[PDB]
Subunit: 259 residues, 4 copies
């Protein structure tokens, strides 16, 4: 039991049923926190995750919601307050992406990604902070960004823009609510072994290509990101606000410049 101060804190996690969201759900369970798992699409996956959280030593519910719908985010935070009594840590983790040459990217496709990856995190952040301010709680927000808030990403201009935006959103909220003890940070994962990438990583030629862009030489394990989230949510990170903490095996250091 690492961060004893996390025990019984209420942690909401959008997209908490798979990948990084699930890894963070589990980790906060290992810290004996009260995890609220948001999911959009697949209850069976969310139920399987709810179980892991409970087994890990935590308490958990699942809540269906589309992060692009204001009522759903408001509902999610309200449900967390109903079920567990309060809110302590808000983790905006939901995200989508798809490759399209930028000059061929449709407005609807651009909007889907912006709506999901950035605006969803804004709504999440807003609702949590609103609750924190009204109830004098020194709460915590973790926004799930990407190396691509810094690394440009051709074929993924919508994704890159969404994370560049998330960066300035996080930094603004951190500055604006710092005097109230509310901290807001980003995590920036590199290439992580999650469902989204499972396709690419099966192709041994593609897996090696991805690996050649990671200086540490391996694709990240999702628990390596959850460890960063645990730290940032904890009182160990008490003087840490408005940062992006990259967990990327060195990827933002320019892989093409390796000796």
């Amino acid at each position: 039991h690492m961060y004893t101060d996390l025990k019984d804190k209420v942690v909401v996690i959008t997209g908490g049923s798979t990948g990084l969201g699930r890894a963070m759900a589990v980790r906060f369970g290992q810290e004996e926190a009260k995890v609220v798992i948001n999911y959009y699409n697949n209850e069976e996956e969310a139920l399987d995750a709810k179980k892991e959280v409970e087994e890990a030593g935590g308490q958990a519910i699942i809540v269906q919601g589309d992060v692009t719908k204001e009522e759903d985010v408001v509902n999610l935070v309200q449900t967390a307050i109903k079920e567990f009594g309060t809110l302590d840590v808000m983790i905006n983790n939901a995200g989508v992406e798809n490759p399209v040459p930028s000059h061929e990217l449709s407005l609807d496709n651009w909007n889907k990604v912006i709506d999901t990856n950035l605006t969803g995190a804004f709504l999440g952040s807003r609702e949590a902070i609103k609750y924190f301010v009204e109830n004098d709680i020194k709460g915590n927000v973790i926004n799930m960004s990407s190396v691509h808030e810094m690394i440009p990403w051709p074929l993924f201009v919508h994704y890159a823009a969404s994370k560049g935006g998330m960066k300035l959103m996080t930094e603004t909220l951190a500055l604006e609510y710092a005097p109230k003890g509310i901290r807001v940070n980003n995590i920036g994962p590199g290439a992580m072994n999650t469902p989204i990438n499972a396709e690419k990583f099966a192709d041994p030629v593609q897996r090696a290509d991805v690996e050649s862009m990671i200086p540490m030489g391996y694709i990240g394990k999702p628990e390596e990101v959850a460890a960063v989230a645990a730290f940032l949510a904890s009182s160990q990170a008490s003087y840490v606000t408005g940062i992006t903490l990259f967990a990327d095996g060195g990827m933002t250091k320019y892989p093409s410049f390796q000796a």
Copy 2:
């Protein structure tokens, strides 16, 4: 005039009838460019701007369009090509802002600012790049950002996000289209003396407050931003792509840290 390579280049400027947009229109007029002035609703200002460009030594048309509307952005670029025969430089300058405590900011208000400031520039950049790619033109995109792609902005989380987003958008498109000789850059204006800012800057105490945030000690003249736009659009900047060039009198250098 200064940049001879700008002579007869077709330059589209969203929000080109007021403030920075207008100053750029005139400057490109001084370079004998052919300017396409986009405006939202105030035709008189647009027409006013139209003649300034002509009087400075260039050609100019005006075209109504709301950058939150895809058809308007598409129509703007199509009109530019119809009227002047081609497109060389695309300037996404339209922007809106308003102060709201962030936890109180409505979804509609957030969207209006994102849609205008970020999505509008995506749409403009896309339509321009599409034309450049289709016609093998080594064209140029300039996106109007702000010191607030770097400086966070309490009460303006939508504005800050929109420009942070615009930075990665620009950087991505510059990387993606660099092999085609298409350059894409941001300009980052600090506090500028634009018509819109006349309200705040008339008041001596508000003017001093703003000036205290500026290490060079004066509010920028719109022509100083237009000078950056002209440089970036010209072949003088031929090896410059994917950058943000701040014209802010030092504002991004943290004004609270000036010595006593």
Copy 3:
């Protein structure tokens, strides 16, 4: 006992007798590590710190050395290997500063600060990595930077340049030695309650002025920085290399822009 993996690791800390170096010495003692405290000037202070480390549950020696002298840094690392068997975590924390209008700053004064703050950290980093590479150890380097690797600092151009340099040094070493599992990171403290600042902070007008530049509204406690060092040295930060982790209460977010 938070980071169980730190127990019995060898941690060298330049300038470990006072301020942040001392706070980190103590913290790694609380993790039951083997702390090597470097000091330049004042044995009595270093002895007082050695005691705190031992009391906190760790083992400790003190080693005199000037970080601007190559032989002293080489000696320090060699002494750590003699006394404790190996090296695991190298923390380059020594630093000096003084205000001078830049156009009046002497070359000797510029050099003292560069030599101390940057070159000392290079020598530290070099000697540790050399040991890591030769002995196949997945070691760790923490370089003590500052908000001023990012915030410019008039009257302190030597200091600012030294930390801007430290940033690219850290990033280069992180990239270069990533394939060997050696991680290299910076910590960037803001205004911290340490000896260097004790003068300024006594003057209630100056203390409030400094506080008005911290969004979180308080001057940092040195243990808040030591918590960051503990994290980064630990296996929790396994996928984290080449970063600067700012612990600054929001200072890098532009204090003049607070609402």
Copy 4:
């Protein structure tokens, strides 16, 4: 010529006889400036450069000096003032580099690179600013950095540190002296086709390798960097201070992330 405000301005350039330094000397010559060419030991190249400036349309002197020596930097700025009457633009361009595994890099080798690349520029900037402050001149400093103030560089940890240091140096001086109208900026060149680089760039495979790191697909011409220097030195950049302007054909945008 282009920047009429540069006519008769006194421009000092360290390492001004070869490569980027030379290209800047010539460009400022084209603007009818008065150039002061610093060189380390090769007088013939310096004299060669001297006549190019004159032939391009400017005045020029040459002055020997090692930037690791304080007296040489001091003498350089003093000579410029003696000969031409004043100083307007200071360009710290001298730089050295060599590849060494970092854990094997000697203290002497580290120091040579820090002393030349970083400390030399501090000394040049200091001497220029001192003169500007003493004589109420709204002067200009340009420090020659590199993409490697942002892009880390295995085997060149000394070079990377020196330019990372140079970035905060420039930013600090810009903040500190902005109230006096003195602007201080970095230029960040990518891979450039300078005499020194002729060795690597003759070999087809090494040329292709380097070109593969450049999104625009070509090695920069020294004149493209000189174009940036001219812009930054001129009053066109009047509101631009404390920035790094990368002229790198997109290199800082992460070339490994270009699409297939």
